[PDB]
């Protein structure tokens, strides 16, 4: 059929192939009356013309280098290769999209280095006493997960500048805590003391030699310390072949950018390291606090995971900050900082139980769409990150790349990287929108009307208007006018009142506001929807008046979004399983639910209502709907057999499950604020002893039989 290659083309191989993703060109000479050289490959094959000269470029996704994913990382970590493939090359024809797949795995044991950054404000003094013997305990607890561990320490109070300091009296300069009769060190912004070393005893030795300072303003400038630790890789010694952890412990608010106006500092912050041989922040008094954007950028560049181990009084603020910075985890730190060890131990698993992907060096020319595959063959469309993973779990991500035209560079490259990992995929894209036959050139050929034109791939393009099939109609020539070759379905104005009927064809004109193309000058740009000063929503390019969407978008205006990252809840189900996600917004089908993810429902049935099936296998290894494999398919809660029955769980309440045995099974559901939902179930539930008639009736019939035997023996004697 005509399709779209036959129309809107037939001018040259370049445009002919640049119309639709599926068009073919017949360079070999053939009958020119069959409208050839722009049609589906099948039509050309039916018309022959395939002597190894058929031109039909197709997209390719050849893998250059690929290595198997390692099982365990213990030695020679330079080739762990936890992300495969490592580097692939893509060749895309104009306006065509191609898909590939990648796999991400955590390689069991992996070296870990942890840098401990602790505030040293007066209120933190007691906390410093509870860390004097943390290195050995941390090493012992972490030995079960990592066989190569390094630890470090840091400090920070605030900018040494008024009004943050006590400038007067002079004695306060060397002893701010002089009113309360105590000894304290002068204020400092950031004081690195211990570099990342494998010697555990060094961490203990360095601690208990430190002190605590004092300041006036309640907020503490910890972002400066975080940025200095992140950027100054050599000073503290981050290791490129290990997982990075940065524990940030604080008990007060944190300053942000533009807060230095009070102290007179106005210079914007820069990420260049400013830690000298004295191990202090030289530019603390002359550099402003860093903004969240720069902090996140420099934290992602260096692949540093952040743990906000903060007190309960400011936990909400750091939770709100956490959802902005990717790869960050929050935690509650006790007043005496005695929960730091377990907090970091569990936060390690929490952070390693999350896989995301980020794109770097992505040119604006092309766009990417993502599908994720969590554990099992289940696939969540429009998602680049999977939750609810564990150590050694393997996940898959399908990435589709779509381009617009062919940029005049022919060499582009970008990278897809999981957060907090050195290994990443390097994707090289080369655009091929030029036909091979064009290399023949033949700028002057006698077939182009005695060498006054150009010949290309079987067609003569000649002069500034010479467009006849034989390169003879010229521009001012062809004065006599023919018919049935300038308008379709005669009865309408020629060239749609836009163009001139010359050489037997409608030459479109008025190259203003864009370009006009088409066998009848009907398709054109600058005739599409305008959302906000941008055509076709500014995402995709519109062809022939249709707002052709680009990747990540689908709609008439191409404003609706396909990726569902924003509409994913924390339970691993889209929109909390109580609604759908459309254009990046959750619509809650279930009544009585509202919120960003349809999660804040106050009037829904309690959890235990749908938890009956989950607890069936744990306590019985049987039950209805066992074919679906409901034992562990949707409920991640852990069931424990404990008869304590006296737990003081604030966010917990007892409930009951009914069994076919007619015995009520009372169990507790605790929804911890950390997300570790746990069920406490009493084993062998006490079924009341009902049946007591069998013995009675057996005794009655035995007595009746005895009476009958007595009668029988009386008869025998008689």
């Amino acid at each position: 059929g005509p399709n779209i290659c036959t129309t809107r083309g037939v001018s040259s191989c370049q445009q002919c192939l640049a119309v639709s993703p599926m068009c073919a060109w017949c360079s070999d000479e053939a009958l020119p009356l069959g409208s050839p050289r722009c049609d589906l490959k099948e039509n050309l094959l039916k018309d022959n013309c395939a002597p190894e000269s058929i031109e039909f470029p197709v997209s390719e996704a050849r893998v250059l280098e690929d290595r198997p994913l390692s099982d365990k990382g213990s030695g020679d970590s330079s080739q762990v290769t936890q992300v495969s493939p490592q580097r692939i090359a893509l060749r895309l024809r104009p306006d065509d999209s191609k898909n590939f797949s990648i796999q991400v795995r955590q390689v069991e044991d992996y070296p870990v280095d942890i840098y401990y950054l602790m505030d040293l404000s007066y209120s933190m003094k007691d906390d410093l006493w509870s860390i004097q013997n943390l290195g050995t305990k941390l090493a012992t607890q972490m030995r079960k997960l990592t066989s190569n561990l390094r630890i470090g320490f840091g400090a920070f109070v605030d900018k040494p500048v008024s009004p943050y300091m006590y400038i007067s009296p002079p004695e306060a300069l060397e002893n701010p805590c002089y009113d309360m009769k105590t000894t304290c060190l002068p204020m400092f912004g950031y004081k690195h003391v211990l570099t990342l070393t494998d010697q555990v005893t060094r961490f203990n030795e360095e601690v208990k030699k430190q002190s605590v300072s004092r300041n006036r303003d309640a907020p503490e400038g910890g972002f400066d310390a975080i940025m200095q630790a992140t950027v100054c890789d050599e000073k503290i010694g981050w290791r490129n072949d290990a997982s990075h952890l940065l524990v940030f412990t604080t008990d007060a608010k944190t300053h942000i950018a533009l807060d230095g106006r009070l102290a007179g500092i106005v210079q914007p912050n820069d990420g260049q390291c400013h830690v000298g041989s004295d191990n202090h922040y030289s530019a603390s008094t002359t550099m402003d606090y860093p903004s969240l954007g720069l902090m996140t950028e420099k934290l992602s560049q260096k692949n540093i995971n952040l743990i906000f181990a903060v007190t309960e009084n400011v936990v909400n603020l750091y939770q709100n900050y956490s959802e902005l910075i990717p790869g960050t985890t929050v935690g509650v730190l006790s007043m005496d900082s005695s929960n730091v060890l377990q907090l970091i131990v569990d936060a390690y698993g929490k952070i390693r139980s999350k896989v995301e992907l980020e794109v770097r060096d992505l040119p604006e020319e092309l766009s990417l769409s993502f599908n994720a595959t969590c554990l099992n063959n289940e696939v969540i469309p429009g998602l680049k990150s999977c939750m609810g993973l564990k150590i050694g779990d393997t996940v898959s991500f399908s990435i589709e790349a779509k381009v617009r035209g062919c940029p005049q560079e022919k060499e582009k490259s970008f990278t897809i990287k999981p957060v907090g990992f050195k290994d990443s995929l390097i994707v090289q894209v080369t655009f091929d929108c030029d036909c091979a036959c064009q290399a023949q050139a033949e700028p002057n050929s006698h077939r182009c009307n005695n060498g006054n034109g150009t010949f290309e791939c079987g067609v003569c393009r000649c002069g500034p208007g010479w467009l006849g099939s034989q390169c003879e109609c010229s521009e001012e020539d062809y004065r006599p006018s023919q018919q049935d070759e300038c308008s379709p379905r005669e009865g309408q104005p020629v060239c749609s009142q836009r163009g001139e009927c010359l050489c037997g064809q409608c030459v479109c004109h008025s190259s203003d506001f864009g370009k006009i193309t088409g066998k009848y000058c009907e398709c054109d740009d600058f005739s599409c929807v305008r959302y906000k000063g941008e055509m076709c929503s500014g995402h995709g390019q519109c062809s022939c008046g249709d707002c052709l969407c680009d990747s990540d978008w689908t709609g008439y205006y191409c404003n609706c979004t396909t990726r569902t990252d924003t509409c994913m809840s924390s339970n691993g189900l889209l929109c909390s399983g109580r609604g759908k996600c459309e254009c990046g917004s959750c619509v809650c089908i279930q009544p009585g639910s509202y919120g960003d993810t349809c999660e804040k429902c106050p009037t829904c049935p309690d959890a235990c209502t749908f938890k009956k099936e989950c607890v069936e296998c744990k306590k019985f290894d049987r039950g209805a709907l066992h074919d679906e494999n409901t034992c562990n398919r949707y409920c991640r809660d852990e069931i424990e057999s404990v008869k304590e029955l006296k737990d003081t769980g604030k966010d917990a309440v007892n409930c009951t499950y009914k069994n076919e045995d007619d015995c009520v099974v009372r169990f507790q559901y605790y929804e911890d604020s950390s997300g570790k939902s746990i069920l406490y179930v009493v084993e062998e539930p006490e079924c009341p002893k009902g049946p007591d008639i069998l013995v009675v009736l057996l005794s009655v019939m035995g007595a009746i039989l005895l009476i009958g035997l007595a009668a029988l023996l009386i008869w025998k004697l008689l």
Partner: protein, 946 residues
Amino acid sequence: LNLDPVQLTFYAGPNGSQFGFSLDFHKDSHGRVAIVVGAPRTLGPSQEETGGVFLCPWRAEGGQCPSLLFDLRDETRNVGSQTLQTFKARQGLGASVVSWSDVIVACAPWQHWNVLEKTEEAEKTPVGSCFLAQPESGRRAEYSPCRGNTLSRIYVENDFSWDKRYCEAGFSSVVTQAGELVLGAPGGYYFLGLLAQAPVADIFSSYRPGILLWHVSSQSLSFDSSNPEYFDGYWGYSVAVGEFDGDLNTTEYVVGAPTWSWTLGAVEILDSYYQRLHRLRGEQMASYFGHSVAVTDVNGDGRHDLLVGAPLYMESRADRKLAEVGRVYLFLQPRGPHALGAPSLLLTGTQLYGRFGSAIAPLGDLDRDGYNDIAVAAPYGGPSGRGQVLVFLGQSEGLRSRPSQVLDSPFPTGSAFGFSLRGAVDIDDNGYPDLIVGAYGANQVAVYRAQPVVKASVQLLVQDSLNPAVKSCVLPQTKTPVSCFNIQMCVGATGHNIPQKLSLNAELQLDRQKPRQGRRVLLLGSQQAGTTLNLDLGGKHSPICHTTMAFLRDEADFRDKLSPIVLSLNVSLPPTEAGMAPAVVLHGDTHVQEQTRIVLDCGEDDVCVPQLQLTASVTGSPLLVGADNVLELQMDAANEGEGAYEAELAVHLPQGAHYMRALSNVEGFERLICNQKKENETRVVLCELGNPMKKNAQIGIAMLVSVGNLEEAGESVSFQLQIRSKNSQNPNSKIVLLDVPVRAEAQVELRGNSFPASLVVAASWGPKVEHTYELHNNGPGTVNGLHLSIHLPGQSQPSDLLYILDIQPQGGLQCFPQPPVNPLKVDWDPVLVSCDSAPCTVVQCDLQEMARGQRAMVTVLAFLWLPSLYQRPLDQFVLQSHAWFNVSSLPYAVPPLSLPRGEAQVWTQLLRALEERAIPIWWVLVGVLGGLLLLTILVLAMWKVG
């Protein structure tokens, strides 16, 4: 828009002095305009940084400026047993400079104050100060509203109550028209922020040299707050003045607190007595919402509007989900005392880390268009990251998202170009306001001078149709008859203070589309298809009209007849002469196209007389207030007369309407094209019906119209439809009016639940059971007069099966029970029970206001009465609670239509560890008796038979 980025004026100060940190205009008694620029880090006499102020006179070439003289020596005084000391080192004098009439107020926020008494002291803290100067009389004065003689021990014992030692007064300053200086102190009251208000005249007349500490009689300051939200709020970062209460006597203040509510930001509108009239909250954490505030009338309605900035705002990008670009919020003051709602307009930057919106400066009517404009500075924006200034023009609906003009930074990297802006003042006396932009990094101030704006109106007139048969003209120098027609071009220039001598080049091109050699109509005079003229409109208020003759070539020379003849007129400025520097900026209608055609198929009369008929219908008639109303208009147009020339469909929509999509049922390859534009105030949509459309053509168009929020359109809205045709006879069709009624309707949902749904009691205080009821206003509209009643069994007595401990309402609803519940303080087969049978306890809740999307919750706690649990424990117990609510009216003009109702019933069932109810052994006994009877009769059968 009309600012000149080529001819600027540069003012320079001492190197490394941060010249240009703050700047302002100053007008003397003679009207002469000068610039006041503060350099916080100017070197003092003792080779130390103390700051300074420079009064630059207006010079075209700029250069160095003189510096105003202020005292820069430490003052030590002894009063009683106290010693008062002032330290001015690194005080940053000039960080905020303002001018009022003949007074220049330059503030040093970081000036330090201290008091010594034997051993104790008040500590050395940056109280700050402000120096007031009167150059004409050469007078000097000082003002420091945060100076005290209270020792630190008193503050410590009083929990730091009324602690003004860290005011940093002078961070932001503003002088009202009445003459009341207002200074912001973000660090006052221990980093809570405050304001200090004082008349300038009182300050001048209440100052005695040598008296460091004094009190002004008319001084007034803001009060302290204990709310944790205000903690570390820096309330006072930016201060502005304006009118918002509707009364001209009172002056309202706008105060920014970027770190309000845990790094969320806020902007508070208060009255003269520091009473919170309104608060505007932030949108994102750490966005520094409220860094800069500006008050101006962008829409021109006569009511001041609000502009807020958030330099640290982060947007979403494909490459990275967070990108610090900054944002600007525009809030428009509505009619009446209605509280400001969501931001009227949002403006977002492009460059990363650009800190867009850090400086917003009003410019007045820069282009003399009747609407005020503004300038927004991004200190580190642009591709090179050197800074930019975007000029936004005003309109009836507000501001335009697209920036009219963008000015780059001629200074090198690190100049912080755009940090300080100021305008709305005429310095060259050319009738237009100018702009001044500081750059402390390069220590230079750049002055941009506005240029006159010339509005051009161009009109082209030509005959609708041409008849080659009639020939009247004759070619020059020959005797060859030929047809001809007249083309008239009118060009008019308008403006204010436009140059007396003005020249404009007007180019006329006939049949532009066709090649030069193939043109059909040619000018009679020069026999050329194109012409150019130089019109001297200088001082010609009325438009200048010119006329020319154009003739059609012989029929043999060309064969095309159907293609329309298009004529284009293009008006432009003369080419750049010696010295460049264009005098004026030209904008408006500088290009006009008009199309004629040859007579064809118009009948023997040779004059086409189209007759157009139009019918319109509307679907989606119910219009709900506050909803995404999408009407569908179906229009059928027919031409029973002759072919219509350049026939289009005009659809005038109401104020809140918009155009989304349009389809044409007739034909599948027609490619219908419709456009939307605002002629004067209405959104007119023009759809192309056809150039010489064929006979008896019938076209149907179905278009979607999105009606926006409407609260004053009245009972019904009106849509107008007509057909526009260029034909001389019957140029337009009959006017069609569609009246769409508007009604307000809202649905309210009541949902009830019980926790736990299933409870089992084994065999004091028993198990806890709670009932929750939620009211949700899912309806697009708003409901008032909401009254709800919750009915529960029992009366909260020991005999009652269930005992109510406490009822918690949430959402502002006011609830009261009856009878009173929880008499004791208490420091801690199914059977149906309901209010209908058992004693009824009714709790009534009221809500006068219930906005769209709001939810109200009511929870009631109780526990099963164990003494009543023990008795008859073998009976299943199902309890029920009932609800009944309804509203009174709606806050909308349209009366319709009653509603809504609600009936919620909540059930809760209880169980026990198996019931001891009599097992149905009666059936077993009956079966045993029947079997015994059957056995007896069977035995007797053969017993009697034998």
